[PDB]
Design a protein around this ligand. Structure first.
Ligand SMILES: NC(=[NH2+])NCCC[C@@H](N)C(=O)O
Length: 340
C-alpha cells in the first residue's frame, strides 16, 4: 500500500484511540430538543426526528429503553455502539453530536440525513445499474478499510442501515452490533439474509463477516433481491451454508467473479481476508473504473440525489405510531449503564 494510505490510517487510528480511551458523556439533555416525528421503531428503542430549541438544527435521536436493553440482553452492545460512535470520524459514517441518559433511557443524537434509507430507494426503483451499485459499494469498501484498521467489525451491513445524503452519498447508521475485536468474537447477531456461514455455525469469527455481507449487499443492489432468500430464517441459513449461489444473467462476468470471492463460504479464501486484505477487492476488475480517492473526497457525481425540501423534511421516511418518551421518577438500571 502507498505510504500515503498507511499514514492516513495511522492518523485515523491515533485519533480514534484518543476518543476511545476518554469517551464523551452527558453532552446534552432531553429538554434541549423538540420532538418532531418517529422515524423508526424496534424491540428496545426508536429513532425520532428532533430539533434543537436554541440552534434550530435537526437531528436523529436514537432512544433506547434501559429496561428493554437489559431484558433483550443488549447491554454490552449498547455500550459498544455509543463508545464506537463517539470515537469514529469518516466521510461515510453518521456523526454523533450528543449523548446522554436519564432515569429510563439512553439517547444518541446524530446528524439527520433526510434522504432516507437505501432500502426504500432500491425497492422503489427495483434494482441499481452496476455503475450505481459500484458507487455505493466503493464507499462501503473504504468505510470497512477504515473500521477494520481500528479493529472494529460492523456486523450489520444492509441497505436499511445506509442513509442517502444530500449529495447522494452514503452515511452508515446504526452501530448497534459494531464491536472492537482483536482476533475473534462469538455473538450471534446481524440480519438473517446477511449472516456469514461462520456466524450461522457458531464459530469464533472476525472481520471476514463484513466482507461476506458486502457480497450480499452488492448482489442485492444489482439484482433487487438478496442471494439467499426464503420464507423462514432456517431455510435462509441452509442456503447460505451450502456454497451455492445463482446469479441473474444480466450480471456482468466481472460482477459474478467478485461476488463468488466475497460470498466464499470458506472464510480463509474470502476476499478481504487474504494476505492482500482490502486490496484484492479494490484491484478487482469490477472496480476498474473506480477512482478511490475521488470517492473518498466526494468528488464523484452521485447516481441520484434524494428528493427532499429541506433539513426537516421527513417524506423519505415512513409513518409510525407516535408513542410517549416517558422518563420514570426512579432511576432504572443505573449500574449497568454507568459508562454511557
Ligand atoms: N433484504 C434486506 N435488505 N432486508 C431484509 C428484509 C426482510 C423483509 N422485510 C423482506 O424481505 O422485505
Amino acid at each position: 500500500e502507498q505510504e500515503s494510505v498507511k499514514e492516513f490510517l495511522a492518523k485515523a487510528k491515533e485519533e480514534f484511540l484518543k476518543k476511545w480511551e476518554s469517551p464523551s458523556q452527558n453532552t446534552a439533555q432531553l429538554d434541549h430538543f423538540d420532538r418532531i416525528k418517529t422515524l423508526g421503531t424496534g424491540s428496545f428503542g426508536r429513532v425520532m426526528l428532533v430539533k434543537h430549541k436554541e440552534t434550530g438544527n435537526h437531528y436523529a435521536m436514537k432512544i433506547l429503553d434501559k429496561q428493554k436493553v437489559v431484558k433483550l440482553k443488549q447491554i454490552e452492545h449498547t455500550l459498544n455502539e455509543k463508545r464506537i460512535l463517539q470515537a469514529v470520524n469518516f466521510p461515510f459514517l453518521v456523526k454523533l453530536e450528543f449523548s446522554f441518559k436519564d432515569n429510563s433511557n439512553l439517547y444518541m443524537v446524530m446528524e439527520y440525513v433526510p434522504g432516507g434509507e437505501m432500502f426504500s430507494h432500491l425497492r422503489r426503483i427495483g434494482r441499481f445499474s452496476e455503475p450505481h451499485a459500484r458507487f455505493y459499494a466503493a464507499q462501503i469498501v473504504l468505510t470497512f478499510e477504515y473500521l477494520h484498521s481500528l479493529d472494529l467489525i460492523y456486523r450489520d451491513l444492509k441497505p436499511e442501515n445506509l442513509l442517502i445524503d444530500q449529495q447522494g452519498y452514503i452515511q452508515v447508521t446504526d452501530f448497534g452490533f459494531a464491536k472492537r475485536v482483536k482476533g475473534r468474537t462469538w455473538t450471534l447477531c446481524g440480519t438473517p439474509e446477511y449472516l456469514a456461514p461462520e456466524i450461522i455455525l457458531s464459530k469464533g469469527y472476525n472481520k471476514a463477516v463484513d466482507w461476506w455481507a458486502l457480497g450480499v449487499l452488492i448482489y442485492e443492489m444489482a439484482a433487487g433481491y438478496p442471494p439467499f432468500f426464503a420464507d423462514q430464517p432456517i431455510q435462509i441459513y441452509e442456503k447460505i451454508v451450502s456454497g451455492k449461489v445463482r446469479f441473474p444473467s444480466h450480471f456482468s462476468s466481472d460482477l459474478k467473479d467478485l461476488l463468488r470471492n466475497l460470498l466464499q463460504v470458506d472464510l480463509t479464501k474470502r476476499f478481504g481476508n487474504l494476505k492482500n486484505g482490502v486490496n484484492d477487492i479494490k484491484n478487482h476488475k469490477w472496480f476498474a473504473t473506480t477512482d478511490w480517492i475521488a470517492i473518498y473526497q466526494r468528488k464523484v457525481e452521485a447516481p441520484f440525489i434524494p428528493k427532499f425540501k429541506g433539513p426537516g423534511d421527513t417524506s423519505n421516511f415512513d409513518d409510525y405510531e407516535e408513542e410517549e418518551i416517558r422518563v420514570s421518577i426512579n432511576e432504572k438500571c443505573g449500574k449497568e449503564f454507568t459508562e454511557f
